[PDB]
Amino acid sequence: MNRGALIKLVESRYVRTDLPEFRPGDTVRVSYKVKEGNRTRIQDFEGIVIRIRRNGFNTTFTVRKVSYGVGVERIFPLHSPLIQKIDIVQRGRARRAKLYFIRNLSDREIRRKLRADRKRIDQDRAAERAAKEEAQK
Amino acid sequence: AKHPVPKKKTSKARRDARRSHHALTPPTLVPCPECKAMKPPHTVCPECGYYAGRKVLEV
């Protein structure tokens, strides 16, 4: 009985451990999409990430696109039909956690508010370390 | 002085009947060990006191 908690942490046997580590910067990625009497076809959603909300398992995040005239927001469980998830630019240099702030004065002014995080770029390049040593090790 | 008001004088009997539950309770007491006295439990009391604690006087 005692761990009303660790019991629940036990049912969470569906966790993911493979998806890129990102925060209010600039991901982009894929999906699941049903129709046509099939369960198939992956669709891509490229955009700025506005919000990450933590709760152990079932933590979610959301992403912001402008499609044609209109802007769009999508919400993802961080678990299950997300095949890949690779990301565009780990810029962010956000100064805060939620930044819905951008929706209202989003244009080219976005860009001067969200420059590149040289620092976190410099360690995605430097996280290259692929052990090149095949027929060599 | 305003809207709602008693229709009739409340009778002596029904006065006292309200008061059946107004009766009082005697305070609950134990004998002060480490001294001859009564004291209410879970209390420090100044004929006495405690041990690894504060109290009245010692000369």
Partner: protein
């Protein structure tokens, strides 16, 4: 259904805060203090925590305590003389005990608060 939660309160924020700050300044100045039970039982943890910051002793924790207590003089005593006397102790730096007899004034039952040793 209010209260499924906790942290008890009479008065309003700015005032309630300041109460704890003054009561604490008192304990640390006098070693023992006497008030109503509920005022006592709250003062308990607010004070324990200032003690424990003075154990780790770093300039930071100093500046952190200066916010609630405000006398430089007093805070020295806190770090220098009071903190050591514990150090090996893990919490419970403070005691609450209930006296007999109330104020013949408002019927308010009292207690005292000791710095422990």
């Amino acid at each position: 259904r209010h209260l499924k939660s906790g942290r008890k309160l009479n008065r309003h924020s700015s005032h309630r805060l300041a109460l704890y700050r003054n009561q604490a300044k008192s304990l640390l100045t006098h070693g023992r203090i006497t008030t109503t039970v509920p005022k006592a039982k709250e003062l308990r943890g607010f004070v324990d925590h200032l003690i424990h910051l003075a154990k780790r002793g770093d300039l930071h924790a100093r500046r952190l305590v200066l916010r609630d207590l405000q006398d430089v003089k007093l805070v020295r005593k806190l770090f220098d003389e009071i903190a050591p006397r514990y150090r090996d102790r893990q919490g419970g730096y403070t005691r609450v005990l209930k006296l007999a007899e109330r104020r013949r004034g408002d019927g308010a039952p009292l207690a005292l608060v000791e710095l422990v040793e």
